[PDB]
Design a protein around this ligand. Structure first.
Ligand SMILES: [Ca+2]
Ligand SMILES: [Ca+2]
Ligand SMILES: [Ca+2]
Length: 408
């Protein structure tokens, strides 16, 4: 769902502010002229080929990622001198900012952070991706709120395909050590600030910072370490419409399904952070994806005894999909409620994405790009149901009606 454009960036976005300076170019705050959504825009100067090759390597990696702790990539632009990434806008709050102010984290609060970092590494490694550059500067809190999740915001040195995995593990140990005592390691040495920190924490740090890569613990081992399990131990409460929406998602038309996915991608950390929190609570192996078993066990834990046949059908649909699991954004798309999304300002977001040339109408050529043969069948069915004009295209009024109709 991540398209590349060749037009002028500034035709779609207002550049509202410069946010900072990266190694390969600046980052700006951008505002979509039509939807008024805010993004971070990462500018990468195509000055040298070694760098240019990194830029596209990063783009190909980021297209694969969908995780609560990983920054979203929405689209890209490219001209002669630059490549631009249109990305999720986070806060400017760095991981160690509170240490500058208040000192070292408590172990409970440090564990909350480490669980998120470990989960992201696990997710990446499970995709056969190594980050290779997990320095503290590559993280940002998604918002200024104290409840904010942490996000990895840069994948410039990441590689799709180990000694590399062990380096990611090592990097996480450096961060953990710093969170707990307020200074970096080697500038495992437990001294005046460590006299009060738990033996569980020391043991984990010891496993993460093992000098010989081959004796270093795996990401699975870190996640299952007593320090993580004990300190972050907490019960899950479904929303009132969650299961209804979940079982209904599959029967929606293909355009509405994509629209909900785009909407979910924009609201995940605010309007629907309830659903995000439910996803995370259900994902007990912290893999960033849900198996049918996680959902079943989760429901049983909640109090459901005899699972209704229509929920069993959802479970089987998950088992039998592309992989046997449901991704983070797909779960959000399937659970989000019309009370949240059925608003012109929200629905305009996916409409503007579909309406590539900004015509005000979605054409067949645009749908052909959107739907990745029998794809022509789907487009035909779509237009038969949605094009109440007969003009062969979908305008915003027709789109809003499609989003609001109850009949499958
Ligand atoms: Ca999982
Ligand atoms: Ca158009
Ligand atoms: Ca029409």
């Amino acid at each position: 769902l991540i398209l590349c454009h060749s037009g002028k960036l500034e035709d779609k976005y207002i550049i509202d502010e410069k946010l900072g300076q990266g190694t390969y170019g600046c980052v700006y705050k951008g505002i979509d002229k039509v939807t008024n959504q805010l993004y971070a825009i990462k500018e990468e100067k195509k000055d040298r080929l070694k760098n240019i090759n990194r830029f596209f390597q990063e783009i190909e990696i980021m297209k694969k990622l969908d995780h609560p702790n990983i920054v979203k990539l929405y689209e890209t632009y490219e001209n002669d001198n630059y490549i631009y990434l249109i990305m999720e806008l986070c806060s400017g709050r760095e991981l160690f900012d509170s240490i500058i102010e208040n000192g070292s984290f408590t172990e409970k609060n440090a564990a909350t952070i480490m669980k998120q970092i470990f989960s992201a590494i696990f997710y990446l490694h499970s995709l056969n991706i190594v980050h290779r550059d997990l320095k503290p500067e590559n993280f940002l809190f998604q918002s200024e709120n104290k409840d904010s999740l942490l996000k990895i915001i840069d994948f410039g040195l990441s590689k799709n395909l180990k000694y590399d995995k062990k380096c990611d593990i090592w990097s996480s140990g450096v961060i953990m050590y710093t969170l707990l005592c307020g200074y970096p390691p080697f500038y495992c040495f437990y001294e005046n600030d460590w006299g009060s920190i738990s033996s569980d924490a020391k043991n984990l740090i010891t496993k993460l910072l093992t000098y010989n890569p081959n004796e270093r613990c795996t990401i699975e081992e870190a996640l299952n370490h007593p320090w993580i399990t004990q300190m972050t131990k907490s019960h899950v409460e479904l929303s009132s419409t969650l299961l209804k929406n979940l079982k209904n998602f599959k029967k929606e038309n293909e355009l509405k399904k994509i629209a909900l996915t785009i909407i979910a991608k924009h609201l995940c950390d605010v309007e629907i952070n309830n659903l995000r929190n439910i996803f995370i609570a259900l994902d007990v192996d912290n893999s960033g994806t849900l198996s049918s078993q996680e959902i079943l066990d989760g429901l049983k834990k909640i109090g459901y005894q005899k699972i209704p046949p229509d929920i069993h059908q959802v479970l089987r649909d998950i088992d039998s999909n592309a992989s046997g699991q449901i991704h983070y954004t797909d779960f959000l798309a399937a659970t989000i409620d019309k009370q949240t999304y059925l608003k012109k300002e929200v629905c305009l977001i996916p409409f503007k994405f579909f309406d590539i040339d900004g015509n005000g109408k979605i054409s067949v050529e645009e749908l052909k790009r959107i739907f990745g043969p029998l794809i022509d069948k789907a487009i035909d069915s779509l237009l038969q149901e949605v094009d109440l004009n007969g003009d062969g295209e979908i305008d915003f009024h027709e789109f809003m009606l499609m989003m609001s109709k109850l009949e499958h």
